[PDB]
Scaffold this active site. Structure first.
Site, PDB file in Angstrom:
ATOM      1  N   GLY A 147      -7.580   9.440  -5.953  1.00 24.06           N
ATOM      2  CA  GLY A 147      -8.046   9.586  -4.563  1.00 24.06           C
ATOM      3  C   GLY A 147      -7.814  10.917  -3.873  1.00 24.06           C
ATOM      4  O   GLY A 147      -8.006  11.029  -2.668  1.00 24.06           O
ATOM      5  N   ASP A 258     -13.236   5.524   4.861  1.00 24.41           N
ATOM      6  CA  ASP A 258     -14.046   6.498   5.562  1.00 24.41           C
ATOM      7  C   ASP A 258     -15.381   5.924   5.960  1.00 24.41           C
ATOM      8  O   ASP A 258     -16.268   5.877   5.155  1.00 24.41           O
ATOM      9  CB  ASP A 258     -14.242   7.769   4.739  1.00 24.41           C
ATOM     10  CG  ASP A 258     -14.909   7.529   3.402  1.00 24.41           C
ATOM     11  OD1 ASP A 258     -15.035   8.502   2.628  1.00 24.41           O
ATOM     12  OD2 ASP A 258     -15.345   6.400   3.116  1.00 24.41           O
ATOM     13  N   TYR A 295      -5.072   1.626   7.200  1.00 26.94           N
ATOM     14  CA  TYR A 295      -4.409   1.457   5.893  1.00 26.94           C
ATOM     15  C   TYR A 295      -2.993   2.028   5.811  1.00 26.94           C
ATOM     16  O   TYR A 295      -2.399   2.054   4.733  1.00 26.94           O
ATOM     17  CB  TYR A 295      -5.269   2.022   4.758  1.00 26.94           C
ATOM     18  CG  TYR A 295      -5.657   3.457   4.961  1.00 26.94           C
ATOM     19  CD1 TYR A 295      -4.764   4.493   4.664  1.00 26.94           C
ATOM     20  CD2 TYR A 295      -6.918   3.789   5.450  1.00 26.94           C
ATOM     21  CE1 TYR A 295      -5.114   5.812   4.849  1.00 26.94           C
ATOM     22  CE2 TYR A 295      -7.282   5.116   5.637  1.00 26.94           C
ATOM     23  CZ  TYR A 295      -6.377   6.123   5.339  1.00 26.94           C
ATOM     24  OH  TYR A 295      -6.740   7.441   5.534  1.00 26.94           O
ATOM     25  N   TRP A 354      -0.912   2.026  -2.247  1.00 22.84           N
ATOM     26  CA  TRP A 354      -1.524   3.303  -2.559  1.00 22.84           C
ATOM     27  C   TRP A 354      -0.507   4.359  -2.120  1.00 22.84           C
ATOM     28  O   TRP A 354      -0.358   4.591  -0.917  1.00 22.84           O
ATOM     29  CB  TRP A 354      -2.815   3.442  -1.737  1.00 22.84           C
ATOM     30  CG  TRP A 354      -3.475   4.792  -1.769  1.00 22.84           C
ATOM     31  CD1 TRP A 354      -2.882   6.027  -1.602  1.00 22.84           C
ATOM     32  CD2 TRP A 354      -4.864   5.039  -1.930  1.00 22.84           C
ATOM     33  NE1 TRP A 354      -3.823   7.011  -1.669  1.00 22.84           N
ATOM     34  CE2 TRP A 354      -5.050   6.438  -1.873  1.00 22.84           C
ATOM     35  CE3 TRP A 354      -5.975   4.212  -2.132  1.00 22.84           C
ATOM     36  CZ2 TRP A 354      -6.302   7.030  -2.022  1.00 22.84           C
ATOM     37  CZ3 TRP A 354      -7.209   4.795  -2.273  1.00 22.84           C
ATOM     38  CH2 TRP A 354      -7.365   6.200  -2.218  1.00 22.84           C
ATOM     39  N   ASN A 356       0.887   8.026  -1.763  1.00 25.69           N
ATOM     40  CA  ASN A 356       0.446   9.424  -1.743  1.00 25.69           C
ATOM     41  C   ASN A 356       1.521  10.430  -2.182  1.00 25.69           C
ATOM     42  O   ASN A 356       1.885  11.320  -1.436  1.00 25.69           O
ATOM     43  CB  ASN A 356      -0.144   9.797  -0.374  1.00 25.69           C
ATOM     44  CG  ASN A 356      -1.508   9.198  -0.157  1.00 25.69           C
ATOM     45  OD1 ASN A 356      -2.383   9.311  -1.016  1.00 25.69           O
ATOM     46  ND2 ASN A 356      -1.719   8.586   1.011  1.00 25.69           N
TER      47      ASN A 356
HETATM   48  C1  LIG Z   1      -5.573  10.976   2.443  1.00 23.70           C
HETATM   49 AS1  LIG Z   1      -4.844  12.310   1.196  1.00 23.70          AS
HETATM   50  C2  LIG Z   1      -2.901  12.104   1.058  1.00 23.70           C
HETATM   51  O1  LIG Z   1      -5.587  12.123  -0.373  1.00 23.70           O
HETATM   52  O2  LIG Z   1      -5.154  13.902   1.836  1.00 23.70           O
END
Ligand SMILES: C[As](C)(=O)[O-]
Ligand SMILES: C[As](C)(=O)[O-]
Ligand SMILES: C[As](C)(=O)[O-]
Ligand SMILES: [Ca+2]
Ligand SMILES: [Ca+2]
Ligand code: NA
Length: 584
Positions: A147, A258, A295, A354, A356
């Site tokens: 992602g 999005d 989210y 998810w 990050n």
């Molecule tokens: C929403 As992101 C942590 O892939 O910039």
């Protein structure tokens, strides 16, 4: 013979003998029954290691017995000597190696595949320890979500990742590259035949390695809900999923992240009907996955309730649908148990995460080479699906990804420092110690605003630096610590020079700017100490020269795109620059 490094850490491991040497040729028992993918992985190993399979049983040869609980193989039951995978959860297995026999029994096929993986980690130069192991994951889904923004992974990068996931018992790969319009900009339309072989190669690679290839669709770009463009667009969604089903896709994710279009009831309706008409209809399809528009906890709750969207979405989505969230924020230090409890409570279900990190798209100059950090070790109480969002840098992502494999399979025993060390050891071999020097300085992510996560950089070095400022401002002798710090800074430059010379192109192309940057900082750090010694020696010429060098090294680090060790090697220069011993 010792137990080698293993990843993930097996649930149960007992050393039961002295170890033995596998013979040049072996007896293979069970390959006809056992999981095909698991057998293929065994055969690949044996070939790469120069171990032949006997066409006929020889009682002098090592015996390898492989199969599942379902199978009836008496040689398996004999060699296990009372140890079994029968009572274990899915993906579980038993592994017994004792007195010339190695026995792998999976609870299921995925499980026999994982048993083989452990076996391949156990064997070193024909030698294997004599162990009994029963093993199974803490969390049921464990993987990567593709992602990140920035330059997509290559096709070869992807194939390599899938094989890497299989080796470390990661079972989930959510596919969503930004350079593939058929996941977003062309979400409605099926793959043309010109793109078929590529997608087939990914689906097949995934299936071979027991990785669920999840196809992520982001319809939100232009999806219509209302009226007859909506019955249209929902059928397009079925058409697409059907064309992917026919290619072999058995897992699907639908994103509402999005969309700007923002109605919880509309998103959840599409999800529920897709669930009934597709995923329940096929019988073959894994639980549907979704990312809601809200989210992260900050976006989902306000004033001790859920916000409108989250309440409606949670109330409307079928209980069987997997819901992702990122923790207390999008990029955040921690997911404490309290946050998982809250969110799980709102959705009345086990959540999917998810995570990050190691993704660096929000601060691309820095590499995130740290372990899973800040994630509660009891998280599995409220979460049964764990993914990490990796860097655009596929090769270097493997370090943190390695730790995620351990965290999600063996959560209760997860030790971030040990797991970090194990990742670099296993990934880098003879280059491990040098890689640790560098990567130690590049674990903390912080864009100076909304995004921060990761173990602090070089904590032990930080502590020694703090001790130096403490001694020097306390009129205490710091002679020996000054000497020690010179050694550390020299070691930093030496390790980086070694990595520049010996790292393969595949890593080097990801980190070469950061290597040069840490060299520059190490050199500014040395100059910083030279300032201190100059002041102690009351040598103003030596002071002024070292000051000019230190400032230069700092300035180049600040200007360069690359970022590393901000709070430690970088900040030490500014601290030294501003320090003035004559006032103590
Ligand atoms: C929403 As992101 C942590 O892939 O910039
Ligand atoms: C030093 As710590 C407990 O924040 O990893
Ligand atoms: C902090 As000074 C001794 O360079 O003025
Ligand atoms: Ca079988
Ligand atoms: Ca910089
Ligand atoms: Na100074």
């Amino acid at each position: 013979v010792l137990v080698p490094n293993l990843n993930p850490t097996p649930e149960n491991l007992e050393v039961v003998g002295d170890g033995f040497k596998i013979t040049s040729s072996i007896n293979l028992v069970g390959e006809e029954e056992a999981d095909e993918n698991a057998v293929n992985a065994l055969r690949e190993f044996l070939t790469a290691n120069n171990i032949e399979i006997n066409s006929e049983n020889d009682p002098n040869s090592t015996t390898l017995i492989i199969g599942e609980v379902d199978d009836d193989i008496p040689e398996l039951d004999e060699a296990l000597n009372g140890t079994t995978a029968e009572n274990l959860k899915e993906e579980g297995y038993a592994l017994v190696s004792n007195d010339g026999k190695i026995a792998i029994e999976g609870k299921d096929g995925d499980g026999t595949f994982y048993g083989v993986q452990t076996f391949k980690q156990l064997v070193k130069e024909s030698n294997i320890p004599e162990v009994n192991i029963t093993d199974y994951p803490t969390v049921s889904a464990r993987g990567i979500v593709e992602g990140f923004y920035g330059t997509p992974w290559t096709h070869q990068d992807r194939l390599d990742q899938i094989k890497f996931y299989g080796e470390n018992k990661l079972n989930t790969y959510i596919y969503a590259p930004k350079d593939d319009p058929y996941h977003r900009e062309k979400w409605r339309e099926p793959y043309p035949e010109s793109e078929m072989q590529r997608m087939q190669e990914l689906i097949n690679a995934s299936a071979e390695n027991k990785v669920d290839f999840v196809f992520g669709i982001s319809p939100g770009i232009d999806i219509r809900f209302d009226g007859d463009a909506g019955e249209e667009d929902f059928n397009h969604l079925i058409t697409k999923a059907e064309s992917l089903y026919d290619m072999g896709v058995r897992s699907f994710a639908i994103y509402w992240d999005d969309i700007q279009d923002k109605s919880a009831a509309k998103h959840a309706q599409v999800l529920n009907r897709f669930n009934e008409e597709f995923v329940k209809a096929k019988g073959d399809v894994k639980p549907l996955i979704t990312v809601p528009t809200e989210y992260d906890t900050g976006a989902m709750v306000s004033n001790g309730q859920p916000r409108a969207y989250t309440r409606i979405f949670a109330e409307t989505v079928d209980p069987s649908i997997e819901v992702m969230w990122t923790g207390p924020g999008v990029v955040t230090n921690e997911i404490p148990l309290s946050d998982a409890q809250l969110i799980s409570g709102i959705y009345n279900r086990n959540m999917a995460v998810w995570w990050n990190y190691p993704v660096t798209d929000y601060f691309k100059g820095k590499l995130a080479l740290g372990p899973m950090h800040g994630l509660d070790k009891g998280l599995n109480q409220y979460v049964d699906f764990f993914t990490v969002n990796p860097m655009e840098h596929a090769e270097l992502s493997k370090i943190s990804i390695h730790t995620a494999a351990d965290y999600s399979w063996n959560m209760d025993n997860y030790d971030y420092d040990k797991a970090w060390n194990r990742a670099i050891d296993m990934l880098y071999g003879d280059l491990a110690e040098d890689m640790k020097v560098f990567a130690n300085h590049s674990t903390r992510m912080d864009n100076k605003t909304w995004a921060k996560s990761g173990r602090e950089d070089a904590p032990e070095l930080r502590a020694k630096m703090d001790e130096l400022w403490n001694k020097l401002s306390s009129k205490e002798d710091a002679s020996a610590l000054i000497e020690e710090l010179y050694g550390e800074f020299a070691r930093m430059e030496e390790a980086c020079n070694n990595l520049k010379a010996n790292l393969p192109e595949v890593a080097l192309e990801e980190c070469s700017r950061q290597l040069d940057e840490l060299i520059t900082l190490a050199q500014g750090d040395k100059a910083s100490l030279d300032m201190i010694v100059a002041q102690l020696n009351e040598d103003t010429e030596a002071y002024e020269s070292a000051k000019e060098i230190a400032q230069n090294k700092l300035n180049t680090a600040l200007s360069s795109f690359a970022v590393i060790s901000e709070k430690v090697a970088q900040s030490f220069i500014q601290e030294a620059l501003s320090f003035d011993l004559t006032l103590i």
